[PDB]
Symmetry: D3
């Protein structure tokens, strides 16, 4: 295990948020983008190996980890469009013209947006369990509400009050998602889960994360733009963990309408957290895809 403190930590002031990140390695820039309920450290198993070939950059999304939580009452500051803008600003701030970009979960949408809005800043991309503009009707539909109920729980003030009421309550809540969304539970050792809980229990982090659901996944939300509804012919490497119940491999059928130059591989013994559950697959497929 490589604990958070065994990386080098940076912060950079962007136009309306401070972004925290770790950075390591040499070569072309590889930008790794996390999801919920993790943060930058979910990539910790692959950063080292990948840094042998890349300048690996791993930020906390705004509202996550040690990155700034914008005005918690202003949901416009938690829109995914701005999170994609943050990545362009991050590259500008670091003097980087082009990067390889990788995302999943919320960052699957960030990458979707990014490669279309900033096409000249991408070399190639990778997405794990990709999410397209046609996700919405499936995800909040029947019977998938059996899996997506939590997106609506997060709309309530009570969810924040309950989940942050104690470290014990927090651990209980988040453990369910790590385990249920994985191919083989437990996903995490006790020490690893403690580190995720440490992060969730930082001031405003549970609230910050739930604001993503309020801004982008309320029943009146629409996080997608016209530009998002275009075909991209950028080379994209896609993986799916067939054990993912919340963004299931059936959703491959939504991909061809948005991409003309991709690969897809269904990983048989992985769920929603590919970089945690099958880190060697991630390292191998990215090194191969981005050769």
């Amino acid at each position: 295990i490589r604990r958070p403190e065994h990386f080098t930590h940076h912060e950079v002031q962007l136009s309306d948020v401070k972004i925290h990140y770790v950075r390591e390695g040499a070569g072309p820039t590889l930008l790794l983008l996390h999801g919920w309920p993790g943060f930058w450290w979910e990539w910790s198993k692959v950063i080292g190996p990948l840094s042998e070939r890349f300048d690996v950059i791993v930020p906390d999304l705004r509202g996550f980890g040690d990155s700034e939580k914008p005005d918690l009452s202003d949901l416009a500051q938690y829109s995914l469009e701005r999170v994609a803008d943050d990545q362009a600003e991050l590259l500008n701030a670091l003097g980087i013209d082009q990067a390889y970009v990788v995302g999943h979960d919320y960052s699957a949408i960030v990458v979707h947006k990014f490669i279309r809005k900033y096409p000249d800043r991408v070399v190639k991309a990778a997405i794990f369990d990709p999410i397209t503009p046609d996700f919405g009707p499936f995800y909040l539909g029947f019977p998938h509400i059996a899996e997506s109920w939590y997106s609506q729980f997060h709309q309530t003030d009570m969810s924040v009050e309950l989940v942050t009421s104690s470290r014990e309550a927090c651990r209980i809540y988040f453990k369910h998602f790590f385990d249920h969304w994985s191919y083989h539970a437990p996903l995490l050792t006790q020490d690893e889960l403690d580190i995720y809980v440490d992060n969730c229990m930082k001031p405003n982090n549970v609230h910050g994360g739930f604001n993503y659901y309020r801004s982008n996944l309320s029943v009146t939300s629409d996080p997608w733009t016209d530009l998002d509804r275009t075909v991209s012919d950028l080379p994209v490497t896609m993986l799916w963990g067939v054990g993912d119940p919340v963004v299931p491999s059936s959703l491959v059928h939504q991909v061809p309408n948005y991409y003309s130059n991709y690969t897809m591989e269904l990983i048989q013994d992985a769920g929603h957290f590919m970089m945690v559950e099958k880190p060697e697959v991630v390292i191998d497929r990215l090194k191969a895809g981005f050769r």
Copy 2:
């Protein structure tokens, strides 16, 4: 306030469960049936006044309050059809030929079932915010999942673990439903909420209640029978609290397909807990309806 201990408590052994109830008054029998997340005591404001005209009987549903929790692993023992059977058995056990029956929430379904399955055991009925066989597609549909998410949360083991992890967690969770489902929050005084929490924290009561959702409201559940899909011409008094967001007054449109002899009244300053929020309305309308 009339605390639980200021009533007379009974238990009776039915064919496969022990049912706890309180009983008070003289006259025709009036059977009052509670919902989730309450228990018999939610009727405590109206029992006394109604007992001036009726033999008021108020049981805990199986799986609730001080009634027996059947085998927690056997969801068939938490089907609403059996809960309706329990009411027929209760009347048999007490030597009662016919009763006036009143329900809401889960007991709206119990009464729906009861008056059709045991039509000769009913004088007249009343339902608050009634639920019909056509409820399902609306309730788990879009956008109502913003309100019904909790029915799916309850499918998880983690929900029980979290909500029972401490009295504080329990209070936080249940308070949301009392307040959000009411017309004007707070619904309850601190002492009143403590009493509901005391009950929820009794061994197996949170689990017992969540089993109702697992048996009757999973995405593969079907609690309705062919007999339920028949028109009843029994006199039924119906009330709706227009402040009810989870079973909203729009659902009046589903009632005419199932009833030919009813009244309906929309109460302007009540939500989901009519007997708690507007007890004088309940007393008046039942005394009038059942004259």
Copy 3:
């Protein structure tokens, strides 16, 4: 029986029609609005009793009874929107700021329109067997044409010629509707039917009534406005006669889209003419509803 001549008769000149009415009693103003094939006198059983608590005003609609028949060739003068305007003008002319208003049949639409167009002139309203903007497709649909055929018969010149060809033909025709639309035929004694026939046989009254069908119920008619398609939160007392075959109690399902503050009661032994068949119910429910 209280014959027409045993009331006090008035006429008032409104902006484009003379309206005939009877008036009786003291208290808040209660405006009672008749339908087809009756006239003001259909209310004759309840006027006296209601006048003990209200200033009861009962007009003939334009085109009916002793009220003026506008230009029989001008269907715009028989639109229901103008009939609703007539009621506002009547109140103005009598120096009345606000009234309780009651309607059924055609006057169900008049009241629908009135309470939305002149909301400041209503205290509370009542409608019997209410008709909403969604009536049309049901009423002229299949199989309801078995009941609504007469609305299309009335489009023909031959219908007027036939029905007015003799007092005997007139009696034969109208008796069918009084009896078939009631819960228990005969609706009327011989003397009562003679009085309705006397009125129908007045010059232009059959034609006047049929013009309502030509203006508002032809296959190219549209009597509803945008304003009519709004929700009203005025207190409205609604009754349905379950024996009504032409505006059946199934149509309760159309009401919730237009009203948020109402009561509904299905009367088991009444049809389309509640004030004729169950006058004591009408008196009781209006006195109660408008207390």
Copy 4:
């Protein structure tokens, strides 16, 4: 004009009805079948001319004219299937192996049925304004109820009472249909209309005719058989009067599904009564079609 008494009148006892007919001429047998509200005499203008080339046989349908009215309470005896059977029996009784058959209105259905059920008894057929098994949804649909309302009026006892209440009422009623269904009103001279009224006023004839509507055109009627829903390749000559509003020329589109060997001609100045309004067209087209 050739009055009824200027023909030779016959009656024949068939298996369950007595059928009246007139007969004239020599050659192949030509069977002419009338509709509502006429009887055999509507063919009176063409019988003479056609008898120069054919053995013309013109019956009253059961329930019409001077033919027997079966048990007026037994609607099964007014089904169109039996009326088609009557034509086969008529031919048998007269020792006729094959005939040319012509129908319209109700007899359009009779001929439809006849040529499929008794195909070996037909040489060729002709239908004016033909009616197929797909008629129903159009005819009782919206907006055609503006034209078909009378089929539902006839379901009522009051319709018989009203229309037979006097010769004057009878004349008024039937004149509407002769005139409105024709291309150019008036269809008839005064003397001609008097003859139709004489026939309608014969005992039970209005009732008999209305029973056709009750048996075959109620909202729960189904006069068509499986055999009727087959394609016929018999030679069929079809005419349409474009002035026919009740069976309009748009209904040509329903014909190709049922016929593979036909002609169609739209007559520009005729309505529903081709043999009355354009007798020379009828004579010419039948002589030509049946050469």
Copy 5:
């Protein structure tokens, strides 16, 4: 047989094409319009007989026969709208105010267009196996692609290369359509087929014909105008060959939406080439229809 050289041949310079035609007879002008894969000579059996009563004019369509092939790369010059314009120009050029016009196949569309765009230049019209604006979805639909495949073959350059590769290849190809589209194959004698092949093998004639398919029957083509979607009340004589598999007699159902003054006759032993397979029927029906 009347060979091409036994007619009198003309050419006239119209505004953007030279049109070749033959002309014969005296009387009102009768304009006969051919289809694919023929040319003017397909009418050769009926021209003589018809010339006894008419001034018969029979042109090659632009792109066919000896008429000019416009710029083969410019599909706008092969639109059917311009082919209809050519007929108006032809009449102008010959000093003819009005003509009887007859078409089938592609010329069914030409006549459809012509009688609506130049209504004052038509006396009466005739169409064989008529084609309306609603043809498209049927013709390129399933299962009719089993018959319409050739319209898509013609989109390819290879079709021209193959079909013109030799006289033998040409004969093989076109013979299929003459025979398969007829009621009884063979349609043609050997000498007659040789004459059609002679014409197809003229420079650019196969290409010219295939351009009709490219301009008017590609999957992105739309040859119809708003004016084409109007009802015509011009007298139109229509025939159908029931043996036509490519424009089948079922399509009669599309005709009533576009015509209010027509006749239709299904010819039992004819297919797609009525003037070739049943010339005496054509002569008789046109002489009769245009009397």
Copy 6:
């Protein structure tokens, strides 16, 4: 170029056909299955390289190449189900328990069928431009008939007569498909095309190939079984040539319903003939996929 004669040729007698094949190499068995309009030799560029790691077996499908043409009048002998059975028999006859199987075009269906019907005879599979049971409605739908027209041309006797009329006609026809279905035309050198034409011109080979279309792709054909409509969890390597217009890369969306364990890669500069246009990709991806 490696000409046909530079391979070793075999024939084996199976239960109802003689199958011709070439075979080369050592290792696990790799069975390569061709499509239309090729034969075994389309694999000629990859056989040698692949034989370094595999026992490569490459048969002509029944009805193709030098394999037997069953009774040309018996379409049941050209059903794809029997072609899949032939592969099981081939393996049995050669004493092979399991093979890697690769297909495209018609053999995409053969492999689909094979891996489900004979699951114990497959190690892993690969499909190029895969075809599933949901292909039909797309392929013969609109607008894809612009591409699929040839499947219906092949239903006609004339297609065989035309295409085999000379070597020149044959070359012209087949060249279109090699070129139009490829990413960059020309697909073939002149010598390579001559070899394909040599094969097509062998007795009955054009007819044999067209029989595949008659048996499996007529508008009344159904080549799929219930077993075909099942999910396979065999490892399958899939490639798509994005330049393929007849089986386009959009059809990836049909794959997830039938496979749970696959990879997909869109090749940017290949069309329908991956093994011909991008042989090094085929060699690399199969060696990698089947390691």
